[PDB]
C-alpha cells in the first residue's frame, strides 16, 4: 500500500497504489482532519506528499512521509498518464488549473514554470458565490452549463458594427462588456460568464507561452474542469482556433499525487 | 481646424489641433450621433478617423474622412507622445487597456499585434455593476480606491506554514478567499478593488509574458481604463516592476489613436 497525496488549496487528491492497480479518492481541504484520521486506520508502506497542505498532514501524522515540490510531481505524474493513454508528445505546455493556474513548459526532459495567473477554480467558486450566493460546487457548475453569455460579454463585432474588424468578429472583446448595454441577469448566465473569463484567460496565456516556446501541444489538467464541460469547451475551441492541439487526460487532476509516488523511491 | 478621432467601444477620443494648440476631448460612444452633429457644424481642414465605431461616423457626416486601423494609429500616436515627453525607447510592448485589451510589440520601425484578452475597462464596468449596482464610472472607481482585497483574494502563502516554491505574497487566486470568509458581508469597495485587481493582474501578466518573448524590458501602458483609477495603475505598475520590467505611462496615452490617425498618411 503506497499512497500519493496532493493536498492542494481546495481538494485533497489521494492516489493509493497496490499491485499496479491504483484507486482514486478525493476530499475537501476543509476536511483535512478526516484525511489524517483515515490515514491512521490504514497500513501504508510509503506515504508521498505534495502541494500546499502537505505540511499540515506531515506534522499531524505519526507515520513517516516525504514531501515533494508540486511542480515536479505534477509534471512527472502528468507524463505518466499521457503515455498510458496513448499520447506521444516530444514537447508541450501544460496548464494546471487548480485553485489558481500554473503554466509550465515541458521540453521532453524536465519542466519549467513559465507563468501563472489567479484565474482558476478558486475564482469560479469565489466570484460564483458573490454573484449567485451558491456555495455547493456541483450546484454551481451544473447551473452554469445552461447559461447564455450574449447579454453579458462583448464581442469584436459589437464594437466594429458593420465595418469588417482587424481581428475575427466572433472573439470576446471584453468579458462582462455587454452588461452596461443590457441594464433592463440570471445566475446561469452570470456563472457561465465567470467560467468563460476564467477559461479565456487561461487559454490565452497557455497559447502565448506555447508560441513563445515553439510547441503546438497544450495539455490542460486540474479539478476546475471536473463536472464543467463548458470550461472544457471554452478552452479546447480557442486552443484549436489558434492552431494548437489541446489535450485532456483522464485523472489528470491526480497528476501531482501520482508524480509524488514516482518521485519517491 | 484639424480633427483626429478614435471612436472606441466605450469612449470617443477627439483630438483638435488649432492655432498650434491641442484640445483633448472625450464623449461617450453612446453619444456618437451627438459627436456626428458637432462634426457637421464645424469648419474642418482634415478629418481622420479610427476605431470600431469610425464607420458609424463616416456614413453619417457631410464631409470626407480618412479611415485607418486603430492598431497602426495607436502605434503612431504613441511614438509621437513618447518622443515629445523625453522618452527614447529602442523597442517596447504597448498594452492598450481599453474596453478590451490589445497587446502590441514595437520593434523600432513598426507594430505587430502579439495578443489580446477581454479583461479591461469594460470588465471593470460590467462586473463592477453586478457586484455593486453602480453604473456611474466615477462612483465605481472612487469607491474602489479605498478597497481592501485581503478578505477576498487568496495569496500563495495562504495555500502553503510551509515555504512555497514561489513568493508567498503573490495572488494565488483572485476571489479565492471568499468561501473562507462567508460570514463577512463583503463591502462594495472591497469587491470592486478585487475586480480591478484581477483585471490588472491578467493584463500585466500577459504584457510581461510577451515582453519576455520579444526580448524587451519596456512596456508602455495606454487606454482610458487608467483614468480616475490609481488602483489599476498601481496594480499594473507594481507588478511590472516586480517582474523586472520598466513600466511607462504616457501623458494623453488614451488619445494615441486619435493623434496617430492624423499622421498615418
Ligand atoms: C500557488 C499555486 C502553485 C498553488 O497550486 P494550487 O493549489 O493547485 O492552485 C497555484 O495556485 C498558482 O500557480 N497560482 C498562481 C500564482 C501566480 O503565478 N500568480 C501570478 C499572477 C499575478 C499577477 C500579478 C500579481 C500577482 C499575481 O500578485 C500581485 O500582483
Ligand atoms: C477588439 C479591440 C481591438 C477593440 O478595441 P477597443 O475598443 O480600443 O478596446 C480590443 O477590445 C481587443 O483587442 N480586445 C481583445 C480581443 C482578443 O484579443 N481576444 C482574445 C481573448 C479571447 C480568448 C478566447 C476567446 C475569445 C477571446 O473569444 C472567445 O474565445
Ligand atoms: N467536489 C468539489 N468541491 C470543490 N471544488 C471542486 C470540486 N470538484 C471540482 N472542483 C473545482 O476544482 C478546483 C480545485 O482544483 P484542484 O486542481 O484540485 O486545485 P487544488 O490543487 O488547489 O485543490 C475548485 O476550486 C473547483 O473549481
Ligand atoms: N467617462 C467614462 N465613462 C465610462 N468609462 C470610462 C470613462 N473614462 C474612462 N473609462 C474607462 O475606460 C474604458 C474605455 O477605455 P478606452 O481606451 O477609451 O476604450 P475604447 O477605445 O474601447 O473606448 C472604459 O471601459 C472604462 O473602464
Ligand atoms: Mg493543485
Ligand atoms: Mg480604443
Amino acid at each position: 500500500m503506497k499512497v500519493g497525496i496532493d493536498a492542494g488549496g481546495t481538494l485533497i487528491k489521494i492516489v493509493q497504489e497496490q499491485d499496479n492497480q491504483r484507486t482514486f479518492k478525493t476530499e475537501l481541504t476543509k476536511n483535512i482532519d478526516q484525511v489524517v484520521e483515515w490515514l491512521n486506520q490504514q497500513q501504508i508502506e510509503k506515504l508521498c506528499l505534495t502541494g500546499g497542505n502537505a505540511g499540515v498532514i506531515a506534522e499531524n501524522i505519526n507515520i513517516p512521509a516525504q514531501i515533494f515540490v508540486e511542480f515536479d510531481a505534477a509534471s512527472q505524474g502528468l507524463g505518466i498518464l499521457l503515455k498510458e493513454q496513448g499520447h506521444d508528445l516530444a514537447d508541450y505546455i501544460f496548464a494546471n488549473v487548480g485553485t489558481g493556474t500554473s503554466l509550465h513548459y515541458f521540453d521532453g526532459q524536465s519542466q519549467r514554470r513559465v507563468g501563472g495567473i489567479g484565474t482558476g477554480g478558486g475564482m469560479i467558486q469565489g466570484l460564483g458565490y458573490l454573484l449567485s450566493q451558491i456555495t455547493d460546487y456541483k450546484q454551481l457548475t451544473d447551473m452554469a452549463q445552461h447559461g447564455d453569455r450574449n447579454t453579458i460579454d462583448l464581442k469584436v463585432r459589437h464594437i466594429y458594427k458593420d465595418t469588417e474588424p482587424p481581428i475575427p468578429g466572433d472573439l470576446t472583446a471584453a468579458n462582462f462588456g455587454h452588461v452596461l448595454h443590457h441594464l433592463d441577469f440570471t445566475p446561469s448566465n452570470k456563472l457561465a460568464a465567470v467560467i468563460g473569463v476564467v477559461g479565456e484567460v487561461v487559454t490565452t496565456m497557455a497559447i502565448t507561452v506555447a508560441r513563445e516556446f515553439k510547441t503546438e501541444n497544450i495539455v490542460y489538467i486540474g479539478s476546475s474542469f471536473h463536472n464543467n464541460a463548458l470550461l472544457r469547451k471554452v478552452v479546447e475551441d480557442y486552443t484549436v482556433l489558434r492552431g494548437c492541439k489541446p489535450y485532456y487526460v483522464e485523472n489528470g487532476a491526480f497528476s501531482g499525487a501520482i508524480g509524488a509516488l514516482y518521485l519517491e523511491k
Side-chain angles (χ1 to χ4, degrees), chain A:
Chain A
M1 176 75 76
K2 291 154 177 55
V3 180
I5 307 177
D6 188 346
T10 311
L11 299 173
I12 297 164
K13 283 69 60 162
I14 297 165
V15 179
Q16 298 171 242
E17 194 181 273
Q18 194 163 29
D19 291 321
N20 279 312
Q21 256 59 44
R22 54 165 85 99
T23 300
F24 299 96
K25 293 185 182 295
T26 304
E27 257 299 340
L28 302 174
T29 292
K30 174 184 152 286
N31 296 326
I32 194 156
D33 297 332
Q34 293 184 45
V35 168
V36 174
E37 175 72 330
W38 178 87
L39 283 168
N40 291 315
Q41 303 182 346
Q42 254 39 253
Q43 182 74 327
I44 291 162
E45 179 62 22
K46 287 268 193 165
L47 184 48
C48 306
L49 305 173
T50 187
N53 286 289
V56 173
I57 296 176
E59 71 204 32
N60 286 29
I61 203 77
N62 58 346
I63 54 163
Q66 291 173 97
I67 308 96
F68 304 97
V69 185
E70 60 167 293
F71 302 153
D72 288 330
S75 175
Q76 296 280 8
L78 180 52
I80 288 171
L81 295 171
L82 289 170
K83 288 173 157 55
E84 290 169 5
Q85 299 170 31
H87 309 290
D88 294 314
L89 311 183
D91 49 41
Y92 46 89
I93 295 298
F94 78 81
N96 192 353
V97 193
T99 309
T101 292
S102 197
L103 301 194
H104 306 259
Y105 169 56
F106 187 73
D107 69 353
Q109 302 188 134
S110 75
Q111 69 84 19
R112 201 190 67 169
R113 191 169 190 278
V114 300
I117 192 66
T119 57
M123 180 163 156
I124 292 173
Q125 283 184 109
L127 188 52
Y129 172 75
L130 294 182
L131 294 168
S132 74
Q133 282 68 233
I134 296 159
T135 59
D136 184 87
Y137 179 79
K138 186 158 175 286
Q139 213 174 289
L140 189 99
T141 45
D142 284 10
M143 196 166 283
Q145 309 304 319
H146 299 245
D148 187 347
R149 296 163 60 189
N150 188 49
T151 58
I152 301 162
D153 289 348
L154 186 75
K155 298 162 101 77
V156 171
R157 64 163 85 121
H158 300 152
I159 296 175
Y160 271 79
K161 307 277 187 304
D162 299 314
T163 54
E164 295 206 327
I167 53 169
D170 202 55
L171 299 177
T172 304
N175 302 88
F176 304 90
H178 231 26
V179 170
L180 289 193
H181 301 102
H182 288 266
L183 297 169
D184 297 359
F185 306 98
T186 57
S188 284
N189 293 344
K190 279 146 64 183
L191 289 168
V194 169
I195 294 154
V197 65
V198 162
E200 290 175 6
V201 177
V202 168
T203 322
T204 300
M205 290 197 51
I207 298 283
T208 305
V209 298
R211 179 186 70 199
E212 174 178 16
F213 295 100
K214 312 205 171 217
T215 178
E216 68 199 69
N217 305 317
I218 302 167
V219 180
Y220 301 93
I221 62 169
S223 306
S224 295
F225 299 110
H226 188 281
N227 196 47
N228 198 345
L230 174 60
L231 178 56
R232 190 79 216 94
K233 185 66 168 156
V234 167
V235 169
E236 282 185 281
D237 291 9
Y238 192 79
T239 297
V240 166
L241 188 60
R242 293 291 291 280
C244 290
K245 290 184 177 187
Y247 293 102
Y248 196 59
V249 184
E250 287 290 73
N251 307 323
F254 298 86
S255 296
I258 292 161
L261 285 162
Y262 171 87
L263 289 160
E264 201 283 318
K265 271 282 275 286

